[PDB]
Amino acid sequence: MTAAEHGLHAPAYAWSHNGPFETFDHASIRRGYQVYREVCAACHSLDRVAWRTLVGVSHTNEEVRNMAEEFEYDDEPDEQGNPKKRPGKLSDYIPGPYPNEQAARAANQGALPPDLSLIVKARHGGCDYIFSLLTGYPDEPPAGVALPPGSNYNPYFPGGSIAMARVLFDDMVEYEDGTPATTSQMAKDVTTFLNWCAEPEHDERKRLGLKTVIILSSLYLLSIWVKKFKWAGIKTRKFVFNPPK
Amino acid sequence: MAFRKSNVYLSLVNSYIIDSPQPSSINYWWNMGSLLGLCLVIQIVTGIFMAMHYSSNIELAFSSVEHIMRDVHNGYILRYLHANGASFFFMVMFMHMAKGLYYGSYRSPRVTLWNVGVIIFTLTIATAFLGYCCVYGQMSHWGATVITNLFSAIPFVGNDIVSWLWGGFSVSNPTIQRFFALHYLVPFIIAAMVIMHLMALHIHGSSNPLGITGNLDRIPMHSYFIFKDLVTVFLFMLILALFVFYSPNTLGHPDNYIPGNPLVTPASIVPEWYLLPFYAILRSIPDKLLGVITMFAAILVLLVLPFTDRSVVRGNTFKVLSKFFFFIFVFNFVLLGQIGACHVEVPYVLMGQIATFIYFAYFLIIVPVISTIENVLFYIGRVNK
Amino acid sequence: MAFRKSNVYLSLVNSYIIDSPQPSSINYWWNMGSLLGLCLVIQIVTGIFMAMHYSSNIELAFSSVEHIMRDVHNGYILRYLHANGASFFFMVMFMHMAKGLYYGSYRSPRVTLWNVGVIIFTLTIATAFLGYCCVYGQMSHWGATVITNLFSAIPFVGNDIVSWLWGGFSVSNPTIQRFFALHYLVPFIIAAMVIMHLMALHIHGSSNPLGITGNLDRIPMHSYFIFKDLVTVFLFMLILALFVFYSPNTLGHPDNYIPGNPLVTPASIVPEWYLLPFYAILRSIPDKLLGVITMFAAILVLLVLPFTDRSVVRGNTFKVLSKFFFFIFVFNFVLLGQIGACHVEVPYVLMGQIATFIYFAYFLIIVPVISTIENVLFYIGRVNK
Amino acid sequence: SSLYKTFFKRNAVFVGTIFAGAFVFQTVFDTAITSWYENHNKGKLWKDVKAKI
Amino acid sequence: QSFTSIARIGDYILKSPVLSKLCVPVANQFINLAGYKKLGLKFDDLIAEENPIMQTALRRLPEDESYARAYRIIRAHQTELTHHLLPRNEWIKAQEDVPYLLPYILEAEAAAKEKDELDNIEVSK
Amino acid sequence: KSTYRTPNFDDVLKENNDADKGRSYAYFMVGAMGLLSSAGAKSTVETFISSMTATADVLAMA
Amino acid sequence: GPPSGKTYMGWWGHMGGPKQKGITSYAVSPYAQKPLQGIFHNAVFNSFRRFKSQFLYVLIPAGIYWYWWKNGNEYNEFLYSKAGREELERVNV
Ligand code: HEC
Ligand code: HEC
Ligand code: HEC
Ligand code: HEC
Ligand code: HEC
Ligand SMILES: C/C=C(C)/C=C/C=C/C(OC)[C@@H](C)[C@H](OC)[C@@H](C)CCc1oc2c(O)c(OC)cc(OC)c2c(=O)c1C
Ligand SMILES: C/C=C(C)/C=C/C=C/C(OC)[C@@H](C)[C@H](OC)[C@@H](C)CCc1oc2c(O)c(OC)cc(OC)c2c(=O)c1C
Questions:
Q1: Angle at the Cα of E63 from the Cα atoms of E62 and E67, rounded to 5 degrees
Q2: E touches B (3+ CB pairs < 8 Å)?
Q3: A40 carries a ligand binding annotation
Q4: Which residue CA neighbors atom 31 of ligand 2 most closely?
Q5: Paired residues of A239 in beta bridges
Q6: Closest CA to A161 of A175, A145, A172
Q7: Which phi-psi region, left, alpha or beta, contains residue A185 (left: φ > 0; alpha: ψ -120 to 50)?
Q8: What is the DSSP letter of A23?
Q9: Which residue, A104, A102, A121, is CA-closest to A113?
């Protein structure tokens, strides 16, 4: 299959979290939320992530309650059955930008921006692909590449033609912690955030993994030594034959 | 007489796990059986516990699993353990089957043991498919579609058998809700099939690497194999632990993280790894009916072995040509799976067909020819008349 | 040697359903056994088929059941069969238990047989209650509530066990979804429990109405009891059909056709007819804890029977005082179940208490006291030393 | 070894002694891992990012 | 496959000096490559015995050859379970690797063949 | 070869100066294996059991 | 319980093997043995002697197949490249 169709293979960047002993960089996760809220959130939903899940991971109980209350959600109708709204609460899920699919495609040349809750896991490459796709938008398609109106070229996406334009540009976000919001510094962040969104069990999982592998390893070694001991009698056993008269 | 011996219940145990006469020389390949037993338990248990959070509904399906993934405490461990357990179930099963071919476990008086085993193999592949559907991700829906459609190949009633399975005009809510029920049911049937497998094993005992009679030197299953099975049990767990905690989705397919969509089959659609060699075979025949018949044949041809094996001795330990061709068979199986993974492109198609040939040829031509040749080679190599 | 005998699988079938030596004199009460086997199948088959349409989700639960009644072809036949099959299961189970209780089948070497049977009773009641919750009707919800709360009686960990089961602050979605999950699982355990009941039966064979040994005159199971069993099978189906087709809801409770509601317990709440006697015993004790201890005790007390029956002969066929007191127990049991369907009002409360006393007093006082007297009575009535 | 003969005196470890020890382990072992793990990931954890705020 | 069959094909080869000079070497090498002699076993010890014919044979075997065979088999299992090979000097030297059970097998086979034939003999008037 | 002439086990027979060595090692191993297994069992059991306790999304404090 | 068909295995005391006579076995207690050694020094050069014998039945087949795959995989990579696009059109349909 022609490489243009397979897509350019995403390179292996050094993620602070790649490693059996490594946790996510919650500092980066936090900045990630911001890059999402100011740039990505205008076209992408995060339907599977409930507000409360940020508490104790990237922000504080107050900070989340505050981000949540800025949105209205449907509440139980009043005395006479009149539908009324309500400010968001921790038990809620991050609201999407479009009320339905038809409306999402209307605002996107006919295309549909996938919900980014499991994007890192729904693609080969994961962090490396998401990150590479974000940063690798060449200012101009290679020679001979005729592009469909309203489309954009990006070598990493399969077929090279992608409906999403480029959105990350230097200094477009003002990082709270004073970090230079360069177009790549951001990509690194949102990606990390999107990774936690898809794999929240992360840190907790690798920790249990360490307990498990240690214990089972010991049980394995111990078991070999025990087996040999029990089998010793049979292993060393000797036979002598004397043909009966 | 001892209680474990006289009691109605305990005695069944005593004669299967405690006093059961084993051949002193059975090696670690004979440990595959207990491992498959463990897989069944793990699968069954992790499954029942997830069922407590799952929703058969086509709308709630994928999300309920993601609910198990996020909201259920230790949920992810249950899912990653079920999911990776299935793949390990197949790895160990193939090994158990391989041990069978190599050591000629299929012949001798152990035929029925073999035949029941084949049934189990068919039942397991079914069970796993049904389960894979419950997630209802892209790979789920399309796999559900393609596989139920295998039956449209049946001459007349064919399309009826299909819309009957679906319970509608296409794979939909009825199909998923029913496939969940079926997925719950079959495992118990497998357990049942396992006891019969054990019953047949129990009348003639297990075999050994030499391929000759063990009756001259036995050692009780207990205080030997209970401890030896334990070595491989722990290892089995360790290696699974590694995937479940440090590499949970390596054995899976990414598309199964995008909900199913009836109007779009991903260009990257690819079967689960353990189904590939079979998928590869069907793909090699450029006709609908033949592709499906040839595929089922690829599974059923396993039944033909106790007859094509013309040898007068059991097992490959002392046969040269046998060992070699046996290994031509194993790798050819791997190459077959490797093929199912690639696209339907020029260098690969012809390769798939040749490999398919080899596969079937091993059972119907190679084994019967070589076994005959080796028989004579043995005779003329020491006979002076 | 014949095949039905020599084959590993048919020899089992053979020694259990074909060549099995039976006592020539066993009456029709011995037909209840196979009836229960049939019942287990009817429940299991009907259930799995209905499961393909059921949704355990609390918001969808009740409606999926109606979807079965209204949209699924023969869905109503499936539902009415399952529901009524559930009641018949108990009418028969009670008879099966009674026959044994009468003919002293719980005695001699058959204790383990009886003890296994008691477990199956506890398990069946459990399975049944799990399934009743799945409709999520008013009775469902409140049955779900009260019963799980039975455990809040346990002193320290109490409430914890309860909220653990619920999986929430109260009976909600988590409760109904894990309850379906478990309602599917237990039946298969019951099935296993049955094979043990059978293994325990098979070593001593059935008893007989005379209560003496049947070794002197045996007749094979096949072509006698296979056909005798057929008579009751049909008779059984005939009456179950009368209910399923002409009176499907007579054995039920109307409140269950109203969707469950957490804020209103209906003033018409009444347990399923087969649970009433036990419900009654619990109501008869004005203490929360003692109420549940006594109720559970009323079930466990059946294990005591092989030790309190001091008689030197087995069965009630030749005991005047025992036959009398047996029926006093039977009717008392019915009265108990009647008090249960009644209100907690003046004459009924005291009545319930007097009967509860009788119930327990039967196994603990009457039987031992009576049988001792009959032993002596049998002696002096013919000894002239 | 003479260390076994003082503690258990040539008798295998008792099933009650096993369970008792099993509990101790659970807590001891866990805290050890949790600590090593948190320390190794210092600066990345929420506890650490929460302080810089 | 029958030994009556194996012995048929084999002898024919062993007789015609053309096939003989060409095959016997391959056969000798095939056997030394098999490795059973290295476990103190003769080929006849390898013959799968779970059938009427072999069972008939083994019973008809003179007491001494039987006890000997018994030892050889046990020895094989002990060695195999220890994952070693017998000390080189204990290996069955090709001259000892005699088809001792074979005559009994063939006898039993042909005896069975006849019984089989006489059971279905047609009649011609 | 006479049956009273016991074969040579001097390749495996330990030269004793600490008679209870094989025993002390075995029993520690066995006991140690037992220790870790109860722990692993207790751990597996607790994992499943606790997977029934209230899910995150239902602990909505109203 | 009735009698079942004859098998090729009994149980302790009547396993159904040949009458054994003359074979004499000696064994020692695991307690009285060297606290598990044998590994290294005596059975390290002994280990891996297996799969040094068998490794050919395994290697030759592996080699034959891995070679065949690789080779065939490169031809794929070529056909779909710029260079081979002319040959690709030949052997495709
Ligand atoms: C609306 C104008 C968008 C903004 C702002 C961002 N995205 Fe987007 N995205 C949009 C479209 C039209 C699509 C469809 C692509 C297609 O042709 O299928 C997407 C897609 C993505 C994807 C999926 C890529 C794939 O493999 O299909 C990703 C990972 C993605 N978008 C990421 C992303 C991020 C992190 C953004 C904020 C910096 C972002 N998008 C903004 C439209 C729009
Ligand atoms: C209810 C009992 C239950 C049993 C018994 C059971 N499963 Fe499942 N299985 C489930 C549930 C629930 C799911 C859906 C959630 C999930 O994906 O884990 C599932 C999903 C699966 C999947 C999808 C894998 C994934 O998670 O992507 C496979 C494959 C599978 N089962 C295999 C098996 C096999 C093989 C067995 C063993 C016979 C088995 N299952 C037994 C309940 C069960
Ligand atoms: C999944 C398989 C399945 C099995 C196995 C099963 N059931 Fe059910 N059962 C259901 C379903 C689905 C319902 C809900 C629909 C209904 O009410 O019939 C149900 C409902 C019930 C009800 C409620 C009665 C009513 O209102 O319909 C009872 C009682 C019951 N089952 C008893 C049993 C008993 C007793 C057994 C076993 C001996 C059993 N069930 C086995 C699936 C099963
Ligand atoms: C078609 C292949 C095949 C399948 C599939 C199979 N078995 Fe077996 N099994 C056999 C044969 C043949 C033997 C006898 C092997 C021997 O000892 O020579 C056997 C033996 C066993 C043994 C004894 C240990 C051993 O490995 O020899 C157990 C236990 C066992 N199988 C369990 C299972 C379980 C559990 C499953 C599946 C859930 C299973 N088997 C699937 C063919 C199969
Ligand atoms: C509380 C006790 C008890 C329960 C509940 C019970 N059994 Fe029994 N069962 C017995 C005893 C005791 C016997 C022996 C009676 C005799 O033959 O004298 C028996 C005998 C039988 C028999 C032989 C035929 C007969 O009726 O004597 C069968 C079959 C049987 N039971 C099936 C079952 C099945 C199936 C269930 C339920 C799913 C069940 N039993 C539940 C006590 C019980
Ligand atoms: C209620 C039960 C019902 C209706 C029927 C179930 C029984 C069917 C089987 O036998 C057990 C079946 C599993 C089969 O066996 C012949 C396997 C080898 C499957 C082979 C298989 O898999 C695929 C798969 O997984 C896919 O996913 C993405 C996609 C696929 O196309 C691209 C396939 C496919 O093309 C084939 C042949
Ligand atoms: C997963 C399994 C779990 C959590 C537990 C199940 C096990 C419990 C049982 O035994 C098996 C239980 C069925 C019990 O046994 C003592 C039965 C005799 C039932 C006794 C029973 O029923 C009622 C019932 O049905 C009702 O309907 C609306 C209402 C009820 O009062 C309002 C009752 C009731 O007051 C009692 C005591």
A1: 125
A2: yes
A3: yes
A4: B131
A5: G25
A6: A145
A7: alpha
A8: P
A9: A104
Per the structure, the complete domain to which residue D33 belongs is given by 1-53
CB contact under 8 A, E48 and B107: yes
Query: Which DSSP helix (H) or strand (E) runs through E117?
Result: helix E102-120
Q: Give all domains of chain E, ordered by start, each with its CATH number.
A: 1-125 (1.10.1090.10)
Domain that holds residue F50: 1-55
Q: Tokens in use for C252?
A: 């039920």
DSSP annotation string for chain G: -------S---TT----PPP-SEEEE---GGGB-SS--TTTTSSSSTTSTTSSTHHHHHHHHHHHHHHHHHHHHHHHHHTSTTTHHHHHHH--
Closest-CA residue to A58 (of A216, A177, A184): A177
The rounded distance, in Å, linking the Cα atoms of B206 and B210 is 12
| 3-state percent breakdown (helix, strand, coil) of chain B, nearest 5 | 70, 0, 25
Total residue count of chain G as it appears in this document: 93
* Residue that the structure tokens 């003479």 belong to: D2
Would you call C310 helix, strand, or coil by DSSP?
coil
For domain A4-200, give the fold: Cytochrome Bc1 Complex; Chain D, domain 2 (1.10.760)
The answer to whether C385 is a known catalytic residue is: no
CA dist C228 and C222 (Å) reads 10
Q: The tokens of C133 are what?
A: 């919750």
Chain G residues within an 8 Å CB radius of F14: 32-35
The alpha carbons of chain D give a radius of gyration, in whole angstroms, of 19
Distance between CA atoms of C253 and C242, rounded to whole angstroms?
18
- Cβ partners under 8 Å of residue D48, min gap 6: A26, A27, D42
Q: What resolution in angstroms, rounded to 1 decimal?
A: 3.0
Q: Which residues of E23-61 are buried (b: 16+ CB within 10 A; e: fewer)?
A: bbeebeebbeebebbbbbbbbbbbbbbbeebbebbbeeb
User: What single-letter DSSP state applies at residue B319?
Assistant: -
The Cα–Cα gap between A57 and A27 comes to 9
H helix count then E strand count, chain A: 7, 5
Number of domains in chain C: 1
| DSSP code, position A142 | P
C-alpha of C171 from chain center: 26
Please give the number of the atom of ligand 7 that sits closest to the Cα of C279: 37
Number of separate domains in chain D? 1
Chains that touch F (3 or more CB pairs under 8 A): A, B, C, D, G
Closest partner CB to F22 (pick from G24, G30, G42): G30
Structure tokens at B128: 């796993």
Query: Rounded to a whole number, what is the distance in Å from the CA of C4 to chain G's nearest CA?
Result: 10
Tell me the one-letter amino acid at A94: I
Cα B48 to Cα B68: distance, rounded to the nearest angstrom:
13
Residue F60 domain flag: no
Quote the CA–CA distance of C49 and C82 in Å, as a whole number.
Answer: 10
CA pair distance A216, B241, nearest whole angstrom: 8
Question: Residue C340: what residue type?
Answer: G
CATH number at residue D29: 1.20.5.260
Closest Cα to atom 30 of ligand 5: C33
The number of angstroms, rounded, from the C-alpha of B72 to the middle of its chain's C-alpha atoms is 30
Give the pairing of strands B21-23 and B218-220: antiparallel
Instruction: Name which of D5, D12, D15 is nearest F20 (Cβ-Cβ).
Output: D5
Q: C173: which chain F residues are within 8 Å (Cβ-Cβ)?
A: 58
Are A185 and A179 in contact by the 8 Å Cβ rule? The answer is: yes
**Could you tell me the two tokens for B272?**
């689960």
Of B54, B92, B20, B68, the C-alpha closest to B240 is B92
Which has the closest alpha carbon to A73: A60, A90, A56, A58? A90
Calpha distance B262→B171 (Å, rounded): 8
How many A from CA of A133 to the centre of ligand 1? 9
Measured in angstroms, the CA of G30 and the nearest CA of chain F are apart by 8
